[PDB]
Write a protein that binds this DNA or RNA. Structure first.
Lengths: 102, 210, 130, 153, 84, 60
RNA sequence: AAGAACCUUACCAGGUCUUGACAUCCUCUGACAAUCCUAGAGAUAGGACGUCCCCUUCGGGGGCAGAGUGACAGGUGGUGCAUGGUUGUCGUCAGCUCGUGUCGUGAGAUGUUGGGUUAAGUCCCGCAACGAGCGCAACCCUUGAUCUUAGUUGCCAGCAUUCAGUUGGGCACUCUAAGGUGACUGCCGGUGACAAACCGGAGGAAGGUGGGGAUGACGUCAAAUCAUCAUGCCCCUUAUGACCUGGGCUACACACGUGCUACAAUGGACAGAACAAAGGGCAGCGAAACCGCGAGGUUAAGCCAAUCCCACAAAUCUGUUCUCAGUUCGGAUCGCAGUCUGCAACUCGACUGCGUGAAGCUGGAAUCGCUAGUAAUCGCGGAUCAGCAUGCCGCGGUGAAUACGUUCC
């Protein structure tokens, strides 16, 4: 009964942009479609960075700026070509890492 | 410190980054092209002026929207100027471009503009004290819960060095919802450069839910 | 789908455990291994088994537990808090004696993140005047 | 300020009592409960082997025998130091007892650490050894010079 | 080094080759001290460029795998105050 | 001599190993992270300027 | 200094250039650019093979080179006793001030003192003062409890399957990240003016600013950085500039600061067994198979990664063995033979095999850290990075002793 299915994945630094993008990318899945799996959470990987405060010495004082990387997955049992043609247009967001695979 | 920049704290919790995008195979190259766009907008800062440019990119696309107190300076007559700028940027970025424009209401309220203006006043060799007073009066005309301002380096050419600051109303940088605008500027008198700083407390932001 | 059994998650310092109090002989099972075997010898294992003995004594219920993360003592402590909370879910009435026992809460504590300029997240290597 | 709360130790399963757990805390080095565990059980075993008696009894008599009744406390009010004798807190009593116990046990020089802990604890049982001698030395520094710490301070 | 093999810059190779086949010229300066001594190179005397001054170096049969520039130390001794 | 240095770097090295990392915003070599090719101070000032998401600062 | 073999590098020595290595204006031709040979250490010069492109009725447009030319360009040159900018320090100490008014000839004072209370100028009450601003606090992040939403690459309990959560299935649970719940002295008791607050107890996953981080107030030290950048002034310019080879930044009689490893039987050595977290990876991580004692190599699957790889956790536990000594303690130093990276490992790289087996058997005077998951200690990862991490930044394992107290520093 198992069959290959399209499984779009999203990635972004900001999360509000990411789950707004998730809602926008599943909303097209809902119309002219069926089932529509929700956006399941992924572990997310941050990158820490310690940098010196002073231009010269005083290495004892520093600061940690870091960049987290969120990830998400979305699925749909029915390929439904009409919402795939609808999928081609995406006004938002400029900052998103959608990836399509079947 | 002794004074950490509020702009380095406000971002994230209460304000958006000046340039948002995603990366990507080349995180550096997007940053290079964007910093270059800052380098040319800085050339546009010479007279046309700008408070800030917001930037967005999505693979072979860019959204370098501008907001400025004087919108017609960059549009020109017939809109030819924004087009020529669009070509000048298209020649460099190597990708499609469509620069946007915005006209801020009560533009004096913005920290960048008042800081650039008082800096130009320092270029005009007007007394720095009276200039800061006119700053506080003008921002008072702008209407705000609290405002602070500061200048450093040579002042009137007197003494080896001096620093001054004036303020009125609450200016709570330690507040995490303060939404305080921050600005810096660099005057260039023959006696020497003049450091410029200004803090603008727009007021607390109340979180929403649906 | 078999005979009814209670279960209680129990973690400590990034070591999570999933106990299952199925009634039976009372022999304990950790990762398909005996507690006498999985952590020889180790006497502390009896301290992992103490809360059941401190409460009326004794059933004794069989335990099927699956634990992951942490070291041996940490995962064993997870077995302890895990059988403790499961014993809490056994009957509501027992909880009163449990207040005298403490033996719950799992106090969250774990090694502190290192401070910059410090080796032990608190310790400073050295100081010297002049 | 004020007094601080102190945690009670998890009781040792063998022999039940928490005080033995206090030994598990003190004898331990490099943060190893297991090494203290092995030396503890081998200690009970070697006590079981020579001169038969309950380990808890000889241990109890030993710890009762190694607690000082008084202790001096140096204070420089002027030229040269001036120790002040005072009655010891029972927690401080068992603390000094166990610390001088493990310390002198460390220096016994025997090839087996457990056997020399045994010889040491039996020396405490027999009112002898370096530990009892040291408590006696503290007894000498005390009493003989308690007059400055009579009821003054 | 490693394998295949010791590495002269290669100009010294043709130089010592031509000097071996004919002429038998003696004493020649070189800036490339990195080159290792070779069996074909034997018996030649090279002025070695330490930097401050060239130091001439004869080549005994015993030296091959040692670097040609190793024999001349750029370092100046010692220098110390009160000897003995 | 930073102009001479950036001129030295932008030109192709005689050997590929030679190419040390350096930021474009400033000509200072050394202590430049390779992953972002920014100055520690370059990245510092841009950090107060805020160039990338997000949080910032000193989490976890 | 988050990587000095060359480069970096600035400094030295030698070899070379003067509108220049780098930017612009002019006139001005011409595409620019490369393919090799010759001489040289390179730097570059001497030759040929070569470029001679794109839009225009001929003026041109375009990068770009070359030529000359005045301009200029250039300095990690001097000045942090000219600075902007950025950062230490007292100090995450609780103070520093202003508006109005009052008092004082005046400077100044009152407010900010006093009583109680607090980590706090914290709150409360009173007070010739009433307010307010910058801080503390709160607001944020992280950690812990729980719910809801959402179940793959992650998850395996209930079911069958298998060498294997691996494969059917399950999407409970662990786990994952969004929105919520929860702590506020609030509930009780006592003290206190019935105020603030403290103490005790209950409730509770966490109790009395829960733990940690971020958050550093007016200012002090003419504190640090002209050498990140920017630059006032001063100085140099066929040279304080530029190119290159090699050096040096690693010196060596010694002093000091700061780490690492040990001086050993709670141990060393061997064998077996067992428990992590977090981070990194496509110019990359590189499994498995095979070759070599080892380091690595040959070859190559998979992985843009909750899939796969870096990758095995180490202490520990279980036994065997040595039986108290410069030792089966420790590893120094050096020799020989290999190996990774790189045009290239002499100066001045790392690692391995073999051999050699310093000193040190716990350290004077003196001095440092730390109140609990802290000290103690064991391994792992990353930034750095061709190669080079005992340093730095993190991750987790194991995990205490003591706090009578403000006499003294």
């Amino acid at each position: 009964m198992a069959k290959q299915k399209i499984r779009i994945r999203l990635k972004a630094y900001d999360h509000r942009i990411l789950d707004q993008s998730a809602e926008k990318i599943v909303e097209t899945a809902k119309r002219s479609g069926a089932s529509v799996s929700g956006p399941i959470p992924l572990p997310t990987e941050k990158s820490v960075y310690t940098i010196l405060r002073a231009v010269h010495k005083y290495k004892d004082s520093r600061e940690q700026f870091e960049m987290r990387t969120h990830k998400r997955l979305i699925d749909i049992v029915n390929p439904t070509p009409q919402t795939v043609d609808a999928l081609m247009r995406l006004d938002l967001p400029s900052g998103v890492d959608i990836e399509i695979k079947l | 410190g002794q004074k950490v920049n509020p702009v380095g704290l406000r971002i994230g919790v209460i304000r958006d980054w000046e340039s948002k995008w995603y990366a990507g195979k080349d995180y550096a190259d997007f940053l290079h092209e964007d910093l270059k766009i800052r380098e040319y907008i800085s050339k546009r800062l010479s007279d046309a002026s700008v408070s800030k440019v917001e930037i967005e990119r999505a693979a072979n696309r860019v959204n370098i929207t501008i907001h400025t107190a004087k919108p017609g300076m960059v549009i020109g007559k017939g809109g030819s100027e924004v087009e020529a700028l669009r070509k000048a940027l298209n020649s460099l970025t190597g990708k499609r471009v469509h620069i946007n424009i915005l006209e801020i209401k009560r533009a004096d309220l913005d920290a960048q503009l008042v800081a650039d203006n008082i800096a130009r006043q320092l270029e005009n060799r007007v007394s720095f004290r009276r200039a800061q007073k006119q700053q506080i009066q003008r921002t008072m005309r702008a209407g705000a819960q609290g405002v602070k301002t500061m200048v450093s380096g040579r002042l009137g050419g007197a003494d080896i060095a001096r620093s001054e600051y004036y303020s009125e109303g609450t200016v709570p940088l330690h507040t995490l919802r303060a939404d305080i605008d921050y600005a810096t500027s660099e005057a260039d008198t023959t006696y020497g450069k003049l450091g410029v700083k200004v803090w603008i407390y727009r007021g607390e932001v109340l979180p929403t839910k649906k | 789908m078999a005979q009814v059994q209670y279960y209680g998650t129990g973690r400590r310092k990034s070591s999570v455990a999933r106990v299952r109090l199925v009634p039976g002989e009372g022999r304990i099972v950790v990762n398909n291994r005996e507690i006498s075997e999985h952590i020889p010898s180790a006497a502390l294992i009896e301290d992992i088994k103490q809360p059941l003995t401190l409460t009326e004594t004794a059933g004794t219920y069989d335990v099927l537990v699956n634990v992951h993360g942490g070291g041996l003592s940490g995962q064993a402590g997870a077995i302890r808090h895990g059988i403790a909370r499961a014993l809490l879910e056994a009957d509501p009435e027992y909880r009163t004696t449990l207040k005298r026992a403490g033996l719950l809460t799992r106090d969250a504590r774990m090694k502190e993140r290192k401070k910059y300029g410090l080796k032990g997240a608190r310790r400073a290597p050295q100081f010297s005047k002049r | 300020k004020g007094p601080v709360a102190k945690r009670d130790v998890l009781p040792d399963p063998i022999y039940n009592s928490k005080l033995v757990s206090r030994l598990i805390n003190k004898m331990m080095i490099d943060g190893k409960k297991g090494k203290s565990q092995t030396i503890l059980y081998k200690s009970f075993d070697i006590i079981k082997e020579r001169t038969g008696n309950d380990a808890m009894e000889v241990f109890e008599q030993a710890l009762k025998n190694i607690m000082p009744v008084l202790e001096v406390k140096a204070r420089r009010v002027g030229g040269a130091n001036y120790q002040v004798p005072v009655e010891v807190r029972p927690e401080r009593r068992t603390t000094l007892g166990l610390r001088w116990l493990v310390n002198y046990a460390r220096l016994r020089g025997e090839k087996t650490m457990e056997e020399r802990l045994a010889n040491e604890i039996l020396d405490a049982a027999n009112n002898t050894g370096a530990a009892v001698k040291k408590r006696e030395d503290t007894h000498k520094m005390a009493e003989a010079n308690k007059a400055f710490a009579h009821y003054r301070w | 080094s490693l394998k295949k093999g010791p590495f002269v810059d290669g100009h010294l190779m043709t130089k010592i080759e031509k000097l071996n086949e004919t002429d038998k010229k003696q004493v020649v300066k070189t800036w490339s001290r990195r080159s290792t001594i070779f069996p074909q190179f034997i018996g030649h005397t090279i002025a070695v460029y330490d930097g401050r001054k060239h130091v001439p170096v004869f080549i005994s049969e015993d030296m091959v795998g040692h670097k040609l520039g190793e024999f001349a130390p750029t370092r100046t001794y010692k220098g110390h105050a009160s000897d003995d | 001599a930073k102009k001479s240095m950036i001129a030295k770097q932008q030109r192709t090295p005689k050997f590929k190993v030679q190419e040390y990392t350096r930021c474009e915003r400033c000509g200072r070599p050394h202590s430049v992270i390779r992953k972002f090719k920014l100055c520690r101070i370059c990245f510092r000032e841009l950090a107060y300027k805020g160039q990338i998401p997000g949080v910032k600062k000193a989490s976890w």
